[PDB]
Amino acid sequence: SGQLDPDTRIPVINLEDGTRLVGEDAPKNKDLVEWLKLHPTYTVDMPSYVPKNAD
């Protein structure tokens, strides 16, 4: 993927218990970025996930 939209939903997984969150349980790329920082135990859970540019 490339040009993504903030409305897009990105699944999150709680490493604490391997928890998974998709659909209504997963925030949108913008809320996911903030949400992610908000909960360290959670790691981005996606099939591939593309950050547009590699760091």
Side-chain angles (χ1 to χ4, degrees):
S1 224
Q3 263 266 118
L4 271 147
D5 275 271
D7 273 56
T8 287
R9 303 271 222 295
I10 317 300
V12 295
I13 173 118
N14 222 5
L15 287 157
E16 250 180 301
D17 40 311
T19 344
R20 267 179 68 226
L21 305 169
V22 295
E24 59 184 72
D25 356 308
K28 334 218 224 281
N29 313 9
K30 58 117 304 171
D31 338 84
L32 184 100
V33 180
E34 266 268 283
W35 189 99
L36 269 159
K37 295 205 265 260
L38 264 145
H39 335 308
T41 170
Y42 276 97
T43 172
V44 188
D45 231 41
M46 234 234 240
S48 218
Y49 201 102
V50 188
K52 255 244 253 215
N53 56 67
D55 57 289

